[PDB]
Structure 1
């Protein structure tokens, strides 16, 4: 049976057919110690996709091969007993179980200390069990039959919670994601594999770059793999050039990575330094007024960079102030400059986050219960989007259960769902917004809220939220009244970003509204409660729909001249034909 249903990895490994494993020496040492145990001799690797599971198993073979194992294990050998033997080559219920018994008996015979391994224990047990190895295997545990289990933590948890027995037969070994630098070392170990595979030379800077990029381009997959994937892709691109050479940091790899989604200048040019020294000036141009809010945000974001602030915590803010103040524009513009995607952010509508708090909760419905979008609202999105702003809209209405989770992620951001998996997105800036202190911004005590008044704003916060929450937010930020002092030019800022996307620039407007329509829109648009929100609405109707009404006359060649044709707003701005 073994010749059909299992692979003698140790012997293959002895011959070659192995990738030298590095950065997992402790996992191997742990595995060896477990296998050596008089009792409870079975280890299990628990990690995530891209972590190094198969390598850990091969690393064990390397120690076996060199007999760099305790006396007990010097006769040990590894066999891959999974997937193909279970379902890919199977047709009916029981095919696996009978084959399994078959190999266990071949294995049980004393053909050296056979140590088996499972690449995916989810394939065993699964759903309904039916003794899919799970009862027979431990039933025969006296006959050596040592085995190394393995799984993602997500499944480990689900499998364990359904069972709880193998959990106490198998020693847990958690396998951590390696540092980017460790990832690079892995890439270096595999450098010649890629060079041979593709026939291209790889520069050391290329390896460094790929690992760094992996952190920055494949947010849902762990670093060894994410980096190795890009390197193989990049090398293949170079091989194509070779076939019609070498692998280089930005010339091949960065662009290859960029080309997986777009990107062409981002990540490559993103040295961060000048965004702070000059990148901050951009938010204050995209968002107008509230310069200190911008600075506060910029500062804290930057503090999370380089782990200067303890890296366990992402920047985190509480945005208090007027609606229509730009508090979310800032969140988006930050995502824009910081990540190059204003819509990468995840919006959390907290006004709906009442007693339901299930699929509607970041953590999701406790796994296994009806309503199986288990973290579909936010966790799953975060797996794909850990490099963006998470924002809580009217967080003051969020159910305490949600607020609790926020606290859990607010610091020590090991974001973990009810699925049993961790996202750990310490790079996700989180913004909570609130109208809680609005009663004090409404005091009008400076368009820029002055001392005491801002303290009353913070006061309201102290009264509503638990101190622990408040003690972990990196800053409370106030979205100061925009006033004429801002909107007199915001209107231009808005009209300009519209121009730039108005007709994809095939045709464009001048729209010189002088002072007259600029003030018309600003004065009738801007609200001291709703801020610029109604202003934007006026632009859509006063200008964009109006311009459309004129273009439908089919009389334009290009540009757009202005003549503001003079109850509230009876003028309607009106630009001339």
Structure 2
């Protein structure tokens, strides 16, 4: 859903139909942690500009005090730091076509939202210099992790029926939307183009993430003339071990670094796996007592 919404916004902007008074897109991502809210922003930045480092990312946890708005506006006249403008405004001014990202926007001071209302409707912002900076060609994304304690709990009080993947997502979406409505001002939520709630990851989704993570590990290994290959049973075991229906794909990464990366490290240190070799990982055993086996070939 989020990919479709983002692609629709990009296509609409590129076809000469987007509103010339507002930014190209305004999205609020919400849901559990480790689902891929930040990964989508990096993927979009890499698609648009060819490199994920072209993303203007702000960590809003550093804006927990009301007097830190000058960090993105600039100091008032006559004060220290007037020679340097707002950190965000200069970056946007140099690159009018860019992607702006606000991580954990709910952890910042409410006064921060005071600024965003100018961007989301008027599409321009004014710094202490008196200059006006336009945001009409940017894509604004706010990632939010609100109400996440309830997802960890799961279900509600009572005799809830045996539900499917549809019901759980609907309940989570309702709870997250209610939390967003309660926490934020009505004006801010009214001006945002899209509010996308990321559903949980399924067991089938985990296998492809295992493939990607093992590809990353192989990329790391290629720097020393080395490679890794996994059988289907190994990937199945990894998906079984690393599945967590609450915390997302991070437990899978921890499992991969604990079961595969560590043993590879001792084997490399011991001199078993010299450069110019390939590591083959397979499974041995049955039931819950299955164990990975590592072998070296040329």
Partner of 2:158: none
Q: Is contact 1:319–1:433 with CA below 8 Å preserved after alignment?
A: yes
- Unpaired runs of 5+ in structure 1? 1-291
Task: For residue 319 of structure 1, give the secondary structure of its aligned residue in structure 2.
Answer: strand
- Of 416, 421, 427, 2:137 maps to 427
- Of 229, 233, 256, 1:511 maps to 229
Q: Is contact 2:200–2:246 with CA below 8 Å preserved after alignment?
A: no
Q: Is contact 2:151–2:246 with CA below 8 Å preserved after alignment?
A: no
Q: CA 1:563–1:434 in structure 2 vs 1: closer, same or farther (change >3 Å)?
A: same
Deviations along 1:14-62, one digit per CA (max 9) or x if unpaired, are: xxxxxxxxxxxxxxxxxxxxxxxxxxxxxxxxxxxxxxxxxxxxxxxxx
Deviations along 1:110-157, one digit per CA (max 9) or x if unpaired, are: xxxxxxxxxxxxxxxxxxxxxxxxxxxxxxxxxxxxxxxxxxxxxxxx
Q: CA 1:539–1:426 in structure 2 vs 1: closer, same or farther (change >3 Å)?
A: farther
Partner of 1:557: 276
Q: How is 1:145-164 mapped onto 2 (pairs within 5 angstroms)?
A: none
Partner of 1:351: 61
Name the CA distance, whole Å, in 1 between partners of 2:133 and 2:51.
20
Q: Is contact 1:509–1:558 with CA below 8 Å preserved after alignment?
A: yes
Name the CA distance, whole Å, in 1 between partners of 2:117 and 2:109.
13
Q: CA 1:304–1:467 in structure 2 vs 1: closer, same or farther (change >3 Å)?
A: farther
- Of 369, 372, 375, 2:86 maps to 375
Q: Is contact 1:415–1:422 with CA below 8 Å preserved after alignment?
A: yes
Structure with the greater relative contact order (CA < 8 A, sep ≥ 6): 1 or 2?
2
Once the two structures are TM-superposed, the CA of residue 375 in structure 1 deviates from its matched residue by 1.9
Q: Is contact 1:322–1:528 with CA below 8 Å preserved after alignment?
A: no
Q: CA 1:422–1:510 in structure 2 vs 1: closer, same or farther (change >3 Å)?
A: same
Partner of 1:494: 213
Q: How is 1:465-484 mapped onto 2 (pairs within 5 angstroms)?
A: 465-484=184-203
Deviations along 1:419-454, one digit per CA (max 9) or x if unpaired, are: 433332323211111122435655477556544542
Once the two structures are TM-superposed, the CA of residue 485 in structure 1 deviates from its matched residue by 2.4
Once the two structures are TM-superposed, the CA of residue 344 in structure 1 deviates from its matched residue by 1.3
Deviations along 1:531-567, one digit per CA (max 9) or x if unpaired, are: 112322443454345434333415242332113467x
Deviates more, 1:294-303 or 1:327-336: 294-303
Deviations along 1:489-511, one digit per CA (max 9) or x if unpaired, are: 2111222244345435x735242
Partner of 1:163: none
Q: Which of the two has greater strand per residue? A: 2
Q: CA 1:502–1:413 in structure 2 vs 1: closer, same or farther (change >3 Å)?
A: farther
Name the CA distance, whole Å, in 1 between partners of 2:249 and 2:262.
18
Name the CA distance, whole Å, in 2 between partners of 1:424 and 1:558.
54
Structure 2-normalised TM-score? Answer: 0.79
Partner of 1:297: 6
| Structure 1 runs (4+) greater than 4 angstroms displaced | 439-442, 444-449, 569-574
Q: CA 1:375–1:447 in structure 2 vs 1: closer, same or farther (change >3 Å)?
A: farther
- Of 31, 52, 55, 1:321 maps to 31
- Of 250, 253, 258, 1:536 maps to 253
Name the CA distance, whole Å, in 1 between partners of 2:125 and 2:218.
40
Task: For residue 575 of structure 1, give the secondary structure of its aligned residue in structure 2.
Answer: strand
- Unpaired runs of 5+ in structure 2? 156-162
Q: Is contact 1:440–1:457 with CA below 8 Å preserved after alignment?
A: no
Q: CA 1:428–1:488 in structure 2 vs 1: closer, same or farther (change >3 Å)?
A: same
Task: For residue 480 of structure 1, give the secondary structure of its aligned residue in structure 2.
Answer: coil
Structure 1-normalised TM-score? Answer: 0.44
Once the two structures are TM-superposed, the CA of residue 396 in structure 1 deviates from its matched residue by 1.2
Aligned residue pairs: how many? 281
Q: CA 1:465–1:496 in structure 2 vs 1: closer, same or farther (change >3 Å)?
A: same
- Of 432, 437, 459, 2:178 maps to 459
Q: How is 1:377-416 mapped onto 2 (pairs within 5 angstroms)?
A: 378-416=88-126
Q: CA 1:491–1:417 in structure 2 vs 1: closer, same or farther (change >3 Å)?
A: farther
Partner of 1:27: none
Task: State yes or no: 1:547 paired with 2:269.
Answer: no
Deviations along 1:184-205, one digit per CA (max 9) or x if unpaired, are: xxxxxxxxxxxxxxxxxxxxxx
Partner of 1:310: 19
Q: Is contact 1:488–1:519 with CA below 8 Å preserved after alignment?
A: yes
